[PDB]
CSV table of C-alpha atoms (C1' of nucleotides) in Angstrom, one decimal:
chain,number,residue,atom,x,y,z
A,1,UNK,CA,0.0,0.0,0.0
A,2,UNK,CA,3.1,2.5,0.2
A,3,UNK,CA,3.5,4.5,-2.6
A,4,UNK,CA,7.1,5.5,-2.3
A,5,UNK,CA,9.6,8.7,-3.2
A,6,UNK,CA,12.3,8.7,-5.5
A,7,UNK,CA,14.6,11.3,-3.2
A,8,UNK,CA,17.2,8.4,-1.7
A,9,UNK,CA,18.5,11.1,1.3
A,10,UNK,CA,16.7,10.4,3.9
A,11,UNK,CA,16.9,14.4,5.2
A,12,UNK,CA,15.2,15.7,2.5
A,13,UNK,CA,11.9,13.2,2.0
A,14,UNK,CA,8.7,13.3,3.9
A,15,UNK,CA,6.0,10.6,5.0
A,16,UNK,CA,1.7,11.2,5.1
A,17,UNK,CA,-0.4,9.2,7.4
A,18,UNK,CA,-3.7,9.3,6.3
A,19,UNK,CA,-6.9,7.1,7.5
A,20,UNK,CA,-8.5,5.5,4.5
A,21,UNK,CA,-8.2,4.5,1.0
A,22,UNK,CA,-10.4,7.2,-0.3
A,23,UNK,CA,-8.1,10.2,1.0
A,24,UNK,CA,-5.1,7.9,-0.2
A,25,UNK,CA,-6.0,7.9,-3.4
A,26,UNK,CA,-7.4,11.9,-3.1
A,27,UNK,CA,-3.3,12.8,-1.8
A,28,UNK,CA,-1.7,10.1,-4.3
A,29,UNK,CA,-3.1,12.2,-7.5
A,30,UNK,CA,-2.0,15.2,-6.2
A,31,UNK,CA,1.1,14.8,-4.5
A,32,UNK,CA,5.1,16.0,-5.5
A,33,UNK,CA,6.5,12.2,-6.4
A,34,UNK,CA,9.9,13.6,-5.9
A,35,UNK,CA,10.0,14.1,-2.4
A,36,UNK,CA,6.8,12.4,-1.0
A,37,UNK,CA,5.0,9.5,0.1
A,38,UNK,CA,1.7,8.1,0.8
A,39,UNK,CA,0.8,5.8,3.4
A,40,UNK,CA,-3.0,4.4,4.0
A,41,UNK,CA,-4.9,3.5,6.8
A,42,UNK,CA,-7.4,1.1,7.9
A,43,UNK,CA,-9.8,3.1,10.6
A,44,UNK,CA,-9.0,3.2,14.2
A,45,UNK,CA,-6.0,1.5,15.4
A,46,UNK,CA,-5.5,-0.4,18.4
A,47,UNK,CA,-4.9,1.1,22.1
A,48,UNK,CA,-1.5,0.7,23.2
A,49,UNK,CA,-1.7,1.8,26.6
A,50,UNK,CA,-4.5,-1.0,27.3
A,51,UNK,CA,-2.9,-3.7,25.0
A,52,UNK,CA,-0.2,-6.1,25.8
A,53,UNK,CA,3.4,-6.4,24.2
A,54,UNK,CA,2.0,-9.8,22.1
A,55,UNK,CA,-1.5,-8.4,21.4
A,56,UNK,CA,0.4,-5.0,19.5
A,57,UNK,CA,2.8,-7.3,17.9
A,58,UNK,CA,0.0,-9.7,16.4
A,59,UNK,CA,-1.7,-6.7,15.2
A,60,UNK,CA,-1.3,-6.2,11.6
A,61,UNK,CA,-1.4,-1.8,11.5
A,62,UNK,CA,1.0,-1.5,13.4
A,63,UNK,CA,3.2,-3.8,12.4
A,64,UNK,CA,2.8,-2.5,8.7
A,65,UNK,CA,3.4,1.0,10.2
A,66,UNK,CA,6.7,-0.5,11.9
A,67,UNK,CA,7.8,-2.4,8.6
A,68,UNK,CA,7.3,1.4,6.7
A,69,UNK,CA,9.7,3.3,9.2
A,70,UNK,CA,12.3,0.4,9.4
A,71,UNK,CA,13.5,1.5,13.0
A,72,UNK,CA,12.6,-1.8,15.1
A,73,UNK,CA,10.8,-2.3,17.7
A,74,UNK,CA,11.2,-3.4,21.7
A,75,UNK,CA,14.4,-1.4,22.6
A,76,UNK,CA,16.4,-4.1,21.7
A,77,UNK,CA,16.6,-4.2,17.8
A,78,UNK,CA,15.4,-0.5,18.3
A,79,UNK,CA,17.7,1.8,16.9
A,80,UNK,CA,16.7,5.5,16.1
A,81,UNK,CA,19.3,6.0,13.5
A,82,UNK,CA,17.7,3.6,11.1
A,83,UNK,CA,15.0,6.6,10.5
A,84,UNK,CA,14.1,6.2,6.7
A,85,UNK,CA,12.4,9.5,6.8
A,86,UNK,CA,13.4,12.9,8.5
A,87,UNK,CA,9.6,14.6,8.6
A,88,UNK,CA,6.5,12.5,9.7
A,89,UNK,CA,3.6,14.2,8.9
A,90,UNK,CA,-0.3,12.9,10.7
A,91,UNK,CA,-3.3,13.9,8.7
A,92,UNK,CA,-6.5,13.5,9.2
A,93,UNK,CA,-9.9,14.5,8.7
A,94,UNK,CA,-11.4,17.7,9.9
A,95,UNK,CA,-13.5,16.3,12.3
A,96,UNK,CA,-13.5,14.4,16.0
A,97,UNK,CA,-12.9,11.4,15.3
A,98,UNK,CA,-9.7,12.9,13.3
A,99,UNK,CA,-8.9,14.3,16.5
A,100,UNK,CA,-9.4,11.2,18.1
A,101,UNK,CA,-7.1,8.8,15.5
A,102,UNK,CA,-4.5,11.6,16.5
A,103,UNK,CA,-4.6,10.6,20.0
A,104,UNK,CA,-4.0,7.8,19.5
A,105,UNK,CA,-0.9,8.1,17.3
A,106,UNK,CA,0.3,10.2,19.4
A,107,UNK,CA,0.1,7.6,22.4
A,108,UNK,CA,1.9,5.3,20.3
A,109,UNK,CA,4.5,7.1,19.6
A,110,UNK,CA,5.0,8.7,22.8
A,111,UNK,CA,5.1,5.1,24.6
A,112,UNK,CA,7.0,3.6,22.0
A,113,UNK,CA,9.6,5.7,20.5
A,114,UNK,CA,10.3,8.7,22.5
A,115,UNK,CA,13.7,9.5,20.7
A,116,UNK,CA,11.4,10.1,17.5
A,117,UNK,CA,9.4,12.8,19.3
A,118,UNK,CA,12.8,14.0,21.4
A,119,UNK,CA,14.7,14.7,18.3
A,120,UNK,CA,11.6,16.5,16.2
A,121,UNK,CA,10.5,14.6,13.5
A,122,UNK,CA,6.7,14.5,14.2
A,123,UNK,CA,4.4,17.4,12.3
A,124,UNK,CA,1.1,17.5,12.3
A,125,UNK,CA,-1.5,19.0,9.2
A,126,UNK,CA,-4.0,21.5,9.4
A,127,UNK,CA,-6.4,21.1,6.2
A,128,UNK,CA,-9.6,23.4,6.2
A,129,UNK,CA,-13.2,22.1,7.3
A,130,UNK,CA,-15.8,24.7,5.2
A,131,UNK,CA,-15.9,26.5,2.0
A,132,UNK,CA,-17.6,29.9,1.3
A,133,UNK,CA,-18.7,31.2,-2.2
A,134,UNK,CA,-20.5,34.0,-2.8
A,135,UNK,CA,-20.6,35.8,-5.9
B,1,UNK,CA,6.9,7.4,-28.3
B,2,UNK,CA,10.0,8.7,-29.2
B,3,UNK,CA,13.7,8.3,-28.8
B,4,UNK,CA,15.9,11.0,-27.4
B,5,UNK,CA,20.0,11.0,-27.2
B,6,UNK,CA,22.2,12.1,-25.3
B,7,UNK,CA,24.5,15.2,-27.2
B,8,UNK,CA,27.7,14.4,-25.1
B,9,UNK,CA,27.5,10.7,-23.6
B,10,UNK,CA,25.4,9.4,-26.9
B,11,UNK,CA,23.1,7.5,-24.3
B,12,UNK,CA,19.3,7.2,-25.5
B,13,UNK,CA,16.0,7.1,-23.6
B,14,UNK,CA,12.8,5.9,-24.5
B,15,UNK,CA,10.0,8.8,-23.9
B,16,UNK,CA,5.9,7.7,-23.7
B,17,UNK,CA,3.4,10.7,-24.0
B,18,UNK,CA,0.2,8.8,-24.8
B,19,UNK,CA,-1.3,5.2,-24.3
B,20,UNK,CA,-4.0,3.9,-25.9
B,21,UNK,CA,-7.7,3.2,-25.4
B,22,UNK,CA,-8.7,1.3,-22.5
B,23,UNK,CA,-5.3,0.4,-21.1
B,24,UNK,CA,-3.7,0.8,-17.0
B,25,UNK,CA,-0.6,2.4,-16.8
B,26,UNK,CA,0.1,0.6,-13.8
B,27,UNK,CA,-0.3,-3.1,-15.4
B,28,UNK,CA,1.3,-2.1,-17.9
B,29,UNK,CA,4.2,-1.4,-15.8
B,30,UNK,CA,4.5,-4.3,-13.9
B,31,UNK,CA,4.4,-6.2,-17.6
B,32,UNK,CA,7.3,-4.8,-19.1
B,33,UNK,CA,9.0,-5.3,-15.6
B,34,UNK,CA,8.1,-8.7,-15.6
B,35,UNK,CA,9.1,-9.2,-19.2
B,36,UNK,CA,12.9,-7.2,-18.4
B,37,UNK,CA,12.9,-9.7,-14.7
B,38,UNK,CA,12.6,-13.0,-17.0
B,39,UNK,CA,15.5,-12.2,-19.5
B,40,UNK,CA,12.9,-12.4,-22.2
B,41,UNK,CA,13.3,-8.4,-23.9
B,42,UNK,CA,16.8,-7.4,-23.9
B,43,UNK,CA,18.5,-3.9,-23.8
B,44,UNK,CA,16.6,-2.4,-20.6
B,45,UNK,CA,18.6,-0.6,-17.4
B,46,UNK,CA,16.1,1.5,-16.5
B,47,UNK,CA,12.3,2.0,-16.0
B,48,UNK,CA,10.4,4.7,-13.7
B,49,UNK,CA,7.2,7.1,-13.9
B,50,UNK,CA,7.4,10.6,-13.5
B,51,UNK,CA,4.0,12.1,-14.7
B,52,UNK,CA,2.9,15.4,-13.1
B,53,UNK,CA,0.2,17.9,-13.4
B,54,UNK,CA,2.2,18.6,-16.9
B,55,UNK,CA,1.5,15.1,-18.7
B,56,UNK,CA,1.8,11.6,-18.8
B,57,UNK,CA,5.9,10.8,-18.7
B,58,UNK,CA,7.2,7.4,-18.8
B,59,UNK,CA,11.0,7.1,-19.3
B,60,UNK,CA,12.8,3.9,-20.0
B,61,UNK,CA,16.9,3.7,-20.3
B,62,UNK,CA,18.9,1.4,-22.6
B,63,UNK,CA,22.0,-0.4,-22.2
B,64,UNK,CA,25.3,0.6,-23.5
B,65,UNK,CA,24.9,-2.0,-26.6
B,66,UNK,CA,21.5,-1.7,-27.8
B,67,UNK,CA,19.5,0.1,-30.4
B,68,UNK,CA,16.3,2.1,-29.1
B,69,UNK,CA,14.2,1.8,-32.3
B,70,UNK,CA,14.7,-2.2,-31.9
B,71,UNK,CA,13.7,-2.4,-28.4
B,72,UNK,CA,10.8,-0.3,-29.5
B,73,UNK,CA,9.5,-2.6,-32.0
B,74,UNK,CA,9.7,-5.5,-29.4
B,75,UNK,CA,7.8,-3.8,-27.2
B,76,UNK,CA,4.8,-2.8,-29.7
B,77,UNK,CA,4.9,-6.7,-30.6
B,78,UNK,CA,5.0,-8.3,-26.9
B,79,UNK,CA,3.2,-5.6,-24.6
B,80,UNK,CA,-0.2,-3.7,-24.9
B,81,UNK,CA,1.7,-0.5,-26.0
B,82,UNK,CA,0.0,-1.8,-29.0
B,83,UNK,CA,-3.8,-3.1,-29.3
B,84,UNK,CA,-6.1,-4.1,-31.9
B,85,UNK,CA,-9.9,-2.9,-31.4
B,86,UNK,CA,-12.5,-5.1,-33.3
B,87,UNK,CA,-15.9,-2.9,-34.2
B,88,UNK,CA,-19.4,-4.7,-34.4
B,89,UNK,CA,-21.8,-2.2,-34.5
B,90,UNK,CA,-25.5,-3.9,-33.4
B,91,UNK,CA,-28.2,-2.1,-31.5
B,92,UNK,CA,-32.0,-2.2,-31.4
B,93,UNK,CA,-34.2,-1.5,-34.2
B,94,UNK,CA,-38.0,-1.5,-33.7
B,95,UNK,CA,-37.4,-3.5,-30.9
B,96,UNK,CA,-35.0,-6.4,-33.0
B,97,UNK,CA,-30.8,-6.7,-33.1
B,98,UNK,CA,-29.5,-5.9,-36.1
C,1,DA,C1',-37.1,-68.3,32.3
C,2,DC,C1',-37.0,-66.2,28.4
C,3,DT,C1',-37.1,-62.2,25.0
C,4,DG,C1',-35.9,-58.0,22.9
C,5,DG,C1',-34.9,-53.2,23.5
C,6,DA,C1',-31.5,-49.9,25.4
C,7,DG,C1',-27.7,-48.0,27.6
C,8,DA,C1',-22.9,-48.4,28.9
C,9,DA,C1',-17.8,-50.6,28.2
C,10,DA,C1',-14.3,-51.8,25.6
C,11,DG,C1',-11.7,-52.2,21.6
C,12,DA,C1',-9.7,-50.9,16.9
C,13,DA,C1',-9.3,-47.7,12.8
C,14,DA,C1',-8.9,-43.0,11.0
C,15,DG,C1',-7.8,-37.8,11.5
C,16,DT,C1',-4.6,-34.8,13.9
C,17,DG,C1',-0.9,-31.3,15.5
C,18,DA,C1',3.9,-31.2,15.8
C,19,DA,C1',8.5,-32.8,13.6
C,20,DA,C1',14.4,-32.6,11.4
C,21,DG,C1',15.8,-31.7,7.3
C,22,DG,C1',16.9,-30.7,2.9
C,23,DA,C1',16.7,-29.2,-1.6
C,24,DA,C1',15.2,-24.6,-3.2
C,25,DG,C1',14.9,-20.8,-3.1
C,26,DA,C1',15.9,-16.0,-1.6
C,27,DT,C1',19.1,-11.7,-0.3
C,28,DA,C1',24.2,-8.6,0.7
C,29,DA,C1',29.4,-8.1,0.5
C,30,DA,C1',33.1,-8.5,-2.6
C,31,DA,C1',35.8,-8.9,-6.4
C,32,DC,C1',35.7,-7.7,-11.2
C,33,DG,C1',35.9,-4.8,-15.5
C,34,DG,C1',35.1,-0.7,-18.3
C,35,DG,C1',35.3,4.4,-19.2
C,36,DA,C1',37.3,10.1,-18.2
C,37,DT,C1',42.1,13.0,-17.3
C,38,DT,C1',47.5,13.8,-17.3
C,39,DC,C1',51.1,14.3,-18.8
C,40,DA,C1',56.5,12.8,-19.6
C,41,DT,C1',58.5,10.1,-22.4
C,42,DA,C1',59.4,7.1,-26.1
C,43,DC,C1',58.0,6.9,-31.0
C,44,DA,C1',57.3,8.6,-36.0
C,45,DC,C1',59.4,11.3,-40.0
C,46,DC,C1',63.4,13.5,-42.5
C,47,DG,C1',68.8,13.9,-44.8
C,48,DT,C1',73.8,10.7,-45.1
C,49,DT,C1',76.6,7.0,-46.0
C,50,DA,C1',79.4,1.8,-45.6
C,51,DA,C1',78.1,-2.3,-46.4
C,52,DA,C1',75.5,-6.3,-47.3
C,53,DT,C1',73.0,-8.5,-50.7
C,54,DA,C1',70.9,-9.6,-55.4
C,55,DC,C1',72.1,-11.0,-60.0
C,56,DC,C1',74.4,-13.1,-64.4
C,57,DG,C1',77.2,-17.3,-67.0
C,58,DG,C1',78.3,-22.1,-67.0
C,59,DT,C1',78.8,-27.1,-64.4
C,60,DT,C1',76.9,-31.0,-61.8
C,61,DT,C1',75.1,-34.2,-59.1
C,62,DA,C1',72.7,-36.1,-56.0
C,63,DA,C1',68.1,-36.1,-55.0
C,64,DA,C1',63.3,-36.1,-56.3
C,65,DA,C1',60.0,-36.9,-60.0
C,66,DA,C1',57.9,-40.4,-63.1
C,67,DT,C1',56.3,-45.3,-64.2
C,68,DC,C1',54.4,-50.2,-63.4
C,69,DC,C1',52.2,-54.2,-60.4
C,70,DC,C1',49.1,-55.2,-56.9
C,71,DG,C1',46.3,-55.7,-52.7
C,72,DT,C1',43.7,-54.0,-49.8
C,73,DG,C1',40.8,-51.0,-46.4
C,74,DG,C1',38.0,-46.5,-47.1
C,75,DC,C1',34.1,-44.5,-49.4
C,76,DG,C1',29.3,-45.6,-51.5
C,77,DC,C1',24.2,-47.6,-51.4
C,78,DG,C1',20.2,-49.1,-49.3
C,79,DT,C1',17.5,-49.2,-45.1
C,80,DT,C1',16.7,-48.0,-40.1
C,81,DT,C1',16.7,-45.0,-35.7
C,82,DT,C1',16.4,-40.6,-33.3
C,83,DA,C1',16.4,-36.1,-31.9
C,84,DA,C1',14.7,-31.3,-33.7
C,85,DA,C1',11.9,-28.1,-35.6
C,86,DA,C1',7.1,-26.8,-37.1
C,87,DA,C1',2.2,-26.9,-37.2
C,88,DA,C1',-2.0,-27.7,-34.5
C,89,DT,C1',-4.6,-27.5,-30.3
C,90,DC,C1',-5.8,-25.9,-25.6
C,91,DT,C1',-5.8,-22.2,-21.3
C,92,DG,C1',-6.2,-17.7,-19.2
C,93,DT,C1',-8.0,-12.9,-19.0
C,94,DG,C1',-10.2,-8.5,-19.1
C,95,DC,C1',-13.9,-5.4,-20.7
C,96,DG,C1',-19.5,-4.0,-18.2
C,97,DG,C1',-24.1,-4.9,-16.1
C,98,DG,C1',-26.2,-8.6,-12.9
C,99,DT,C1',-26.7,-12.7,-8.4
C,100,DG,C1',-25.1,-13.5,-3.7
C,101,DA,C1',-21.8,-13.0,0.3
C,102,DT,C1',-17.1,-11.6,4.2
C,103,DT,C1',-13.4,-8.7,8.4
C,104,DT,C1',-10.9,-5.3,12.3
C,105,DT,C1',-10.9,-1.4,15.9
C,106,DA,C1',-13.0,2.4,20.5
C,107,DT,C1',-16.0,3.3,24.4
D,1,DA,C1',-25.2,-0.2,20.7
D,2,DT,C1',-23.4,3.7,17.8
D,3,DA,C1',-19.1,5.1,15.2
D,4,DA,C1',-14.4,4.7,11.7
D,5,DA,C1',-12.4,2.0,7.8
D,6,DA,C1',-12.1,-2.4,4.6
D,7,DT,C1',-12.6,-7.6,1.4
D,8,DC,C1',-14.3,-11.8,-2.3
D,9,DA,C1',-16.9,-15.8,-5.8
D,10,DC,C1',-19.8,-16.6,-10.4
D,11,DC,C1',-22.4,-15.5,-15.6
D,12,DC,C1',-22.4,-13.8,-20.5
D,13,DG,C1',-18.6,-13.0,-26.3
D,14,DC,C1',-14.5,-12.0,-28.3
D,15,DA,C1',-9.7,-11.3,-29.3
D,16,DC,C1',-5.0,-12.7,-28.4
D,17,DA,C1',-0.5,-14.3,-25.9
D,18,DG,C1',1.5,-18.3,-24.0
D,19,DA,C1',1.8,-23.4,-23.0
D,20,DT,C1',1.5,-28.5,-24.5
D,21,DT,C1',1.1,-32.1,-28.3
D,22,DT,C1',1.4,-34.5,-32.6
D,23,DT,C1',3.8,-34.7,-37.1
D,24,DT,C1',7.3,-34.3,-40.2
D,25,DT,C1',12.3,-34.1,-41.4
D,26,DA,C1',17.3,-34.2,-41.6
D,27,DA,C1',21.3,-36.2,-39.3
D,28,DA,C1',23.6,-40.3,-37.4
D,29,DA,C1',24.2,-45.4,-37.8
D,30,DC,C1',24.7,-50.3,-39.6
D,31,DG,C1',25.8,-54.0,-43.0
D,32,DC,C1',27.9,-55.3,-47.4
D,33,DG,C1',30.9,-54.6,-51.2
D,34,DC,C1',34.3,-53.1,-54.6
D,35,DC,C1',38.0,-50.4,-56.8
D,36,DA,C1',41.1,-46.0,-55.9
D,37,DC,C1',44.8,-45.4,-53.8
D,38,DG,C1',49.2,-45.9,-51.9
D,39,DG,C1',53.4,-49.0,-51.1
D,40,DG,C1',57.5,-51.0,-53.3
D,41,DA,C1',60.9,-51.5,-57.0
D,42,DT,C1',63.2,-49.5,-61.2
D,43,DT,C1',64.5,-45.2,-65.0
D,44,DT,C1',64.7,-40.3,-65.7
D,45,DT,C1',65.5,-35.4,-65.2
D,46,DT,C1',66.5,-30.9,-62.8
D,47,DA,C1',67.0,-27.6,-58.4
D,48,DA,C1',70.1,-25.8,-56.2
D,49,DA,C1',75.0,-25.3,-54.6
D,50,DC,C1',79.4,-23.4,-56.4
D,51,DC,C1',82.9,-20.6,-58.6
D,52,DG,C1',83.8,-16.0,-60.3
D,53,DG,C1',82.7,-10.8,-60.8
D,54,DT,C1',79.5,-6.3,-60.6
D,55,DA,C1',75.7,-3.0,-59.2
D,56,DT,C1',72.5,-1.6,-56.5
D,57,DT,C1',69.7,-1.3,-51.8
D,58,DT,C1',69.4,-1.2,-46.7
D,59,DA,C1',70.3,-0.1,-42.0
D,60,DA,C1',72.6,2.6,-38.6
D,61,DC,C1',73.1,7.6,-37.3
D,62,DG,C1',71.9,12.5,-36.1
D,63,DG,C1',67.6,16.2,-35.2
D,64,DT,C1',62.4,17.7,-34.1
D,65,DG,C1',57.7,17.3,-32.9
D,66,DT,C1',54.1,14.8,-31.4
D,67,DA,C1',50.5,10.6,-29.7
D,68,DT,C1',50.2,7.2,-26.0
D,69,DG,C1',51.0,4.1,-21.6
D,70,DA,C1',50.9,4.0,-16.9
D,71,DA,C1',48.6,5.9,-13.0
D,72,DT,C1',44.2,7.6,-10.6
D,73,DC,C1',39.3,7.8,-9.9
D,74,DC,C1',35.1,6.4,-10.2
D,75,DC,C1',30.4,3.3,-11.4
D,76,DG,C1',27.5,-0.7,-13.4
D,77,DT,C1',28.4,-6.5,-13.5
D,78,DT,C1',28.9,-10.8,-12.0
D,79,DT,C1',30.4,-14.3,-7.9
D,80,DT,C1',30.1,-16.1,-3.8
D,81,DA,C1',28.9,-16.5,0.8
D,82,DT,C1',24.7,-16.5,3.6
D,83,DC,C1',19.9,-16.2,5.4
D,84,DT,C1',14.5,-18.4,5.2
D,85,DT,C1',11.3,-22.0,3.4
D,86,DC,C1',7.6,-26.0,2.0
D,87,DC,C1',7.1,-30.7,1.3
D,88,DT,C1',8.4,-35.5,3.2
D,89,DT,C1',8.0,-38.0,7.2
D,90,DT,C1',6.7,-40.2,11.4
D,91,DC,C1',4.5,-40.3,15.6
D,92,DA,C1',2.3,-39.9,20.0
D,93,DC,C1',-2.4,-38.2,20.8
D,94,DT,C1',-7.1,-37.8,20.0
D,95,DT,C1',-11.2,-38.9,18.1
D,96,DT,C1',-14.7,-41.7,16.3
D,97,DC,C1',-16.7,-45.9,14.7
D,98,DT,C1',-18.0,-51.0,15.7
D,99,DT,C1',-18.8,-54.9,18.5
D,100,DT,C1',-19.9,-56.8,23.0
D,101,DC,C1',-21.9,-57.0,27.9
D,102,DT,C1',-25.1,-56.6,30.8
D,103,DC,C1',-29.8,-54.5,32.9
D,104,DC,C1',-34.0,-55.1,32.9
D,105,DA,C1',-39.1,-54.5,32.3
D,106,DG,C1',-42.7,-57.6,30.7
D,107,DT,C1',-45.1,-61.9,30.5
DNA sequence: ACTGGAGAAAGAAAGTGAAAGGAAGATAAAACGGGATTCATACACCGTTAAATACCGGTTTAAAAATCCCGTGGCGCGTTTTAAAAAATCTGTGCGGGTGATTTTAT
DNA sequence: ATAAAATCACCCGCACAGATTTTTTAAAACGCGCCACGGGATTTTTAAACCGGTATTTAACGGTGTATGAATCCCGTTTTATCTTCCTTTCACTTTCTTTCTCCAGT
């Protein structure tokens, strides 16, 4: 489901998060193929904070979202200098339950790579909810 | 299609503007890359998309020791870079095919 | 005592989840081979001359060419095998309206 | 119980690319036979060495002005060493089917 870059330097490439398959393909036709990738979604994900260790693992989301940064995962493998892209970018739709899917990224990658969110790599989009014509 | 060279290396690309009727870029993608993976079309190093807001661009590189116009031809005969479109005009005339 | 139905025991055959391992794949590190520069340095081209070699006239002689008899194996013919290439026959697949169905997360 | 996001099978005609499957054809082979060819023993003739001498023809030598060979720096190519894997296989376990042994109510 990745639609991938051409740029090979990992500083100067970027990554979207986005929920469905829908606003996949809406980004995918209008994107900059130099410098920027797509990744899809499948609805809420799971809660990490109430999960177990082998319930995130067997989960198949997350483990797609783990393949596509290519960091590791459980501290041991882990290492942060493995980062395939300098800017992560979360966006979502406009309304709560956008808010809502952004919680809970944002719990995951709090609880499981801090050095991510330490170092700045996390961004987050701000696309528009109305539009107004008149005349 | 066309074929563009190089004016100082000599190298020579491959340049596709326009597909025809009914076909998906996309399968048609994975076929010639399929073809090049099995050794059975010869003279290819290179293959990517780069179509923008401009166009449609597909470019594909030869090898040091090939001619473009020959790969060409290859590819019209084996993929759907080339496609044959049969008409048969029926519809419904006072309620009967004809 | 005897009969026939029914439930429980016991025994044997089939399906099952887990099993080294090995040929069969697959993926990285390494050794390789083929172009762009950079000159110093050895190589290509031009006058001079002593010397080494080609050439002619007439022998000759020993060696090679020419000739005859014969007895064989190496080509030629006819008839079979056997791979190799070509023609013929099957197998998938996608286009667009229709029939009917599946799964994962949060509170 | 309300919300967020997803997935698959078949029917109907037609055209073509790719994968078996017969069918034909040219090369390789075997058995038999005969005559073309080469060996051996005489005649014959001529190619080249040898003496002259003469008349050219080449190679070594001394100046100028380049074209190229070894060295350096890269990047696509191919090898080799190194990981994971699905079918074969048994095998102890479990399950499920078939026969037997009583109970036992009724008359």
């Amino acid at each position: 489901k990745l639609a991938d870059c051409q740029e090979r330097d990992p500083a100067l490439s970027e990554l979207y998060l986005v929920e469905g398959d829908s606003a996949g393909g809406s980004a995918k036709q209008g994107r900059n193929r130099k410098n920027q990738a797509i990744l899809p979604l499948k609805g809420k994900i799971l809660n990490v904070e109430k999960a177990r260790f082998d319930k995130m693992l067997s989960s198949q989301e997350v483990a797609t979202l783990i393949t596509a940064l290519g960091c590791g995962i459980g501290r041991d493998e882990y290492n942060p200098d493995k980062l395939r892209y300098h800017s992560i970018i979360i966006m979502t739709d406009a309304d709560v339950d956008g808010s809502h899917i952004r919680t809970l990224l944002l719990t995951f990658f709090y609880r499981q790579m801090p050095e991510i969110v330490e170092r700045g790599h996390v961004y987050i989009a701000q696309p528009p909810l109305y539009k107004v014509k008149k005349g | 299609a066309e074929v563009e060279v190089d004016a100082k290396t000599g190298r020579e690309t491959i340049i596709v503007h326009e597909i025809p009727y009914q076909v998906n870029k996309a399968r048609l993608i994975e076929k010639i890359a399929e073809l090049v993976k099995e050794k059975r079309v010869e003279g290819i190093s290179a293959l990517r998309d780069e179509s923008d807001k401009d166009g449609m661009r597909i470019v594909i590189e030869v090898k040091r020791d090939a001619v473009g116009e020959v790969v060409l031809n290859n590819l019209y005969s084996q993929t759907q870079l080339q496609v044959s479109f049969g008409i048969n005009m029926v519809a419904l005339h006072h309620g009967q095919p004809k």
